[PDB]
Amino acid sequence: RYVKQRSLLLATGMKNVPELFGAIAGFIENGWEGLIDGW
Amino acid sequence: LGQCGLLGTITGPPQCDQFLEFSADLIIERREGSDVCYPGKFVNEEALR
Amino acid sequence: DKICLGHHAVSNGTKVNTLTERGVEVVNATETVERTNTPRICSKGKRTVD
Amino acid sequence: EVEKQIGNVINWTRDSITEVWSYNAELLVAMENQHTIDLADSEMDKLYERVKRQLRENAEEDGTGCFEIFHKCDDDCMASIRNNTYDHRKYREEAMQN
Amino acid sequence: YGFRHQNAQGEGTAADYKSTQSAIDQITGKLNRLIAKTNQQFKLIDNEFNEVEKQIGNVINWTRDSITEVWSYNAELLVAMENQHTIDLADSEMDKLYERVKRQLRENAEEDGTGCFEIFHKCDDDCMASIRNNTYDHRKYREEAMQN
Ligand SMILES: *[C@@H]1O[C@H](CO)[C@@H](O)[C@H](O)[C@H]1NC(C)=O
Ligand SMILES: *[C@@H]1O[C@H](CO)[C@@H](O)[C@H](O)[C@H]1NC(C)=O
Numbered sequence: 001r002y003v004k005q006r007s008l009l010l011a012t013g014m015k016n017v018p019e020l021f022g023a024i025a026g027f028i029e030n031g032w033e034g035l036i037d038g039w
Numbered sequence: 040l041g042q043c044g045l046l047g048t049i050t051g052p053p054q055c056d057q058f059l060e061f062s063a064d065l066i067i068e069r070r071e072g073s074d075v076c077y078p079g080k081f082v083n084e085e086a087l088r
Numbered sequence: 089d090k091i092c093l094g095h096h097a098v099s100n101g102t103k104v105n106t107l108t109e110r111g112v113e114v115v116n117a118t119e120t121v122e123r124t125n126t127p128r129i130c131s132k133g134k135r136t137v138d
Numbered sequence: 139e140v141e142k143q144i145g146n147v148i149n150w151t152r153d154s155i156t157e158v159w160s161y162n163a164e165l166l167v168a169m170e171n172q173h174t175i176d177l178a179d180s181e182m183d184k185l186y187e188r189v190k191r192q193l194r195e196n197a198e199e200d201g202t203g204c205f206e207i208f209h210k211c212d213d214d215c216m217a218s219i220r221n222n223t224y225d226h227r228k229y230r231e232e233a234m235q236n
Numbered sequence: 237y238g239f240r241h242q243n244a245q246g247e248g249t250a251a252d253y254k255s256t257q258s259a260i261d262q263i264t265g266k267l268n269r270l271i272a273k274t275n276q277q278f279k280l281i282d283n284e285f286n287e288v289e290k291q292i293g294n295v296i297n298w299t300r301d302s303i304t305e306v307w308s309y310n311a312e313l314l315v316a317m318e319n320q321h322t323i324d325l326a327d328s329e330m331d332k333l334y335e336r337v338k339r340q341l342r343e344n345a346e347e348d349g350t351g352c353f354e355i356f357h358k359c360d361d362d363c364m365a366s367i368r369n370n371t372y373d374h375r376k377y378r379e380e381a382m383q384n
């Protein structure tokens with residue numbers, strides 16, 4: 001279908017923290033590169 | 040265009056005489072705008088308007 | 089005693105459009121609008137008359 | 139050159155249809171960003187809800203996401219909560235005094 | 237939001253700082269994406285003074301009504317999420333406050349039911365100036381909070 005705008009997107013997962021309940025950087029406020037398989 | 044009708048600007052009936060060669064970014068036409076003076080109509084006139 | 093924890097992180101995310109915000113740090117995206125045509129009439133499998 | 143009046147109607151209908159599909163384009167994306175946040179949230183409580191159940195009188199809740207084990211724990215003890223083989227009846231006489 | 241302490245000195249309704257204005261910050265964001273940008277120009281397909289032909293005029297009216305029914309349908313769906321998008325911000329501050337208050341005072345509370353912490357030690361005004369602005373020493377007062 002024809003459209004006017006020239007880019008529209010998606011994701012796979014997490015909003016990113018550099019080192020709707022508040023879990024990504026919450027009281028666990030931080031991230032990793034410690035484990036490397038999952039999130 | 041007031042009492043001029045917008046298809047009269049290429050014919051010039053006697054109320055479009057101040058309008059024959061206008062130049063506008065907004066044309067305005069009125070309910071009392073009669074496109075003609077001699078009674079008649081333009082064929083396929085909504086393509087022309 | 090104390091056995092501490094967290095979760096992962098990565099070092100580059102990119103923009104998106106929400107309802108209420110512009111340009112977040114989100115890891116991926118892909119275009120939903122294709123811009124790149126194939127500049128040739130691809131007619132395998134159809135008998136074709138140019 | 140299709141005729142001007144229908145050509146106007148076609149262009150007006152195509153533009154109107156264009157305005158509809160383009161309007162619909164930008165609403166589909168905003169939920170998928172939302173549909174990714176919850177999965178971190180629904181795992182965050184999942185981990186939170188798991189860790190307070192397998193070790194019963196053996197913790198106080200933290201603020202950093204880290205439990206303080208109320209008894210001695212070496213590597214053979216590390217192999218009990220990680221793979222669902224912890225005996226939370228056997229170590230409770232000594233975790234009350236710690 | 238709010239901060240409130242009360243003691244044997246006085247009574248006060250204060251503010252607790254690290255999110256208290258931030259109810260502008262996603263609240264400023266909703267509204268221009270919503271009060272959006274219209275840029276397409278629409279011409280004059282039909283005439284209100286004299287009579288486009290009936291068949292195309294029916295097609296125009298049917299197409300305009302059909303388009304009208306689409307835009308009117310789309311009108312009433314945009315609003316219902318924004319009511320939802322306001323409830324979460326009270327919720328995401330409610331746990332934020334809840335998650336803050338159990339961390340700065342460690343062995344100094346039992347959780348309430350009314351949203352009120354019972355401080356396990358003596359606290360006057362100089363003690364009120366410790367948790368409110370992130371200057372509380374939760375190592376120093378713990379020998380006496382275990383006995384209370
Ligand atoms: C993101 O999308 C790209 C698209 O090609 C894919 O190759 C990649 O595996 C995805 N994930 C990450 C973490 O980059
Ligand atoms: C309809 O719009 C196109 C642009 O996509 C333009 O080239 C064409 O001349 C228009 N047709 C009429 C009849 O105005």
Ligand SMILES: *[C@@H]1O[C@H](CO)[C@@H](O)[C@H](O)[C@H]1NC(C)=O
Pocket residue numbers: 217221223
């Ligand atoms: C941990 O659990 C797995 C099954 O999930 C089991 O096979 C294994 O023997 C357990 N212990 C260790 C030390 O891996």
Ligand SMILES: *[C@@H]1O[C@H](CO)[C@@H](O)[C@H](O)[C@H]1NC(C)=O
Pocket residue numbers: 288289290291293294297
């Ligand atoms: C189209 O609907 C309008 C009402 O908006 C009406 O005045 C007009 O007569 C209709 N046109 C035809 C050709 O039926």
Ligand SMILES: *[C@@H]1O[C@H](CO)[C@@H](O)[C@H](O)[C@H]1NC(C)=O
Pocket residue numbers: 365369371
């Ligand atoms: C509270 O914190 C502020 C900074 O946020 C600091 O300047 C001030 O000295 C502290 N104490 C009092 C009593 O305001």
